[PDB]
């Protein structure tokens, strides 16, 4: 057999999947993840896949550090993953504009509160739920004709911006955790225009 290698955590909005190599020839894998202070819990058993969904484990506590290991068996050798702390490390997903509306000489732009895989009882917690005041949004607004790169920032889910009369603007939003070291920013939302 070959030991697994290049173990990576693929994660967005807490949806979390460990990946590795190689594509197995005459062998199988079993993944074990560790609470770090309990034990080695397997989540995948004797699979021919080179990935394991670990969402259900990390969403139990997203402010924990997780280790994983991948055992190799013939159709024994193992390898330790890098450390993964979900809260600090998981990628923010692409946001969606909920609504824009022309309130007087200003425009209101609302971002959807994105749902995550973190679960508490019977609620699937949202970005806002998990991150709270650590979460900020950025907006970009312009009419694609003269292209005026004007920026707005909000602590909530709503922007209140100044606009020119009769002018059709285009909008795109971004999710931002200023506090982070890595993956501070989501990808941009689909553009919405008047």
């Amino acid at each position, epitope marked *: 057999t070959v030991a697994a290698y290049n173990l990576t955590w693929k994660s967005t909005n807490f949806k979390t999947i460990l990946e590795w190599e190689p594509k197995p020839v005459n062998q199988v894998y079993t993944v074990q993840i560790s609470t770090k202070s309990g034990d080695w819990k397997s989540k995948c058993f004797y699979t021919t896949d080179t990935e394991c969904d670990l969402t259900d484990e990390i969403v139990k506590d*997203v*402010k*924990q*550090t997780y280790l994983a290991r991948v055992f190799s068996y013939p159709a024994p050798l193992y390898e330790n993953s890098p450390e993964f*702390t979900p*809260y*600090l490390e998981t990628n923010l997903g692409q946001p969606t504009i909920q609504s824009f509306e022309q309130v007087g000489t200003k425009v209101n732009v*609302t*971002v959807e*509160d994105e749902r995550t895989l973190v679960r*508490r009882n019977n609620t699937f*917690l*949202s970005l*806002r*739920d*998990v*991150f*709270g*005041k*650590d979460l900020i949004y950025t907006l970009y607004y312009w009419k694609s004709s003269s292209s005026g790169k004007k920026t707005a920032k909000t*602590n*909530t*889910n*709503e922007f209140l911006i100044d606009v020119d009369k009769g002018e059709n603007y285009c909008f795109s939003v971004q999710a931002v955790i*200023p*506090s*982070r*070291t890595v993956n501070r920013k989501s990808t941009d939302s689909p553009v919405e225009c008047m």
Partner: antibody
Amino acid sequence: QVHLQQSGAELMKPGASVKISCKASGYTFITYWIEWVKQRPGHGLEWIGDILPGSGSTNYNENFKGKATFTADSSSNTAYMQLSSLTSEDSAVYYCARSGYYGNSGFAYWGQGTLVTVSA
Amino acid sequence: DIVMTQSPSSLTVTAGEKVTMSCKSSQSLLSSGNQKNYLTWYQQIPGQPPKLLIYWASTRESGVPDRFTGSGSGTDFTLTINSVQAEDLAVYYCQNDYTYPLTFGAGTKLELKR
């Protein structure tokens, strides 16, 4: 259990500084904010700001800038606040607490405090 | 700054009664995005630092008994210690838990008559 450990009680003279340590056991050090809180005898509670270990981010209460210094050594499980130019409005009890597990869930755990006493 | 004024400033009651105190942010802790009142509650008894009571105005923290009850929306709130225990003896503070700066109440001095 989670345990915030604040450094022992201190006396300093109305001039130079004082380093206070919050040593946190019982969880993952880097993923929760630590909080600094002044409490005076009969004054309610006062929020100096916060800091996230592992990314070193900080937010100060504007009335203090000039006074407070938040730091934490990731790799020794301890957060730090230094206070300069000590005075009487500095003499108080100082508090370290952990952020919320569920996002905006207040302060959850608190350090036992430390009395700052400022006189010659 | 979101200022918080608590009231009554103090209050003194007998064991067993029901108590109510009000908390009022200078403007709204209502995140219309997901309908949450971003207010928080502390109990501070003699000889110990703040105990966290309730988050999101009306979510009871693990352990904390069901006889305390948070309520209100936006800029008007209410801890109601229903059927006061003697051990409930504290000063309670609500705390803005929404936007920076992080702020506090004046505090509410609960004392016990007997």
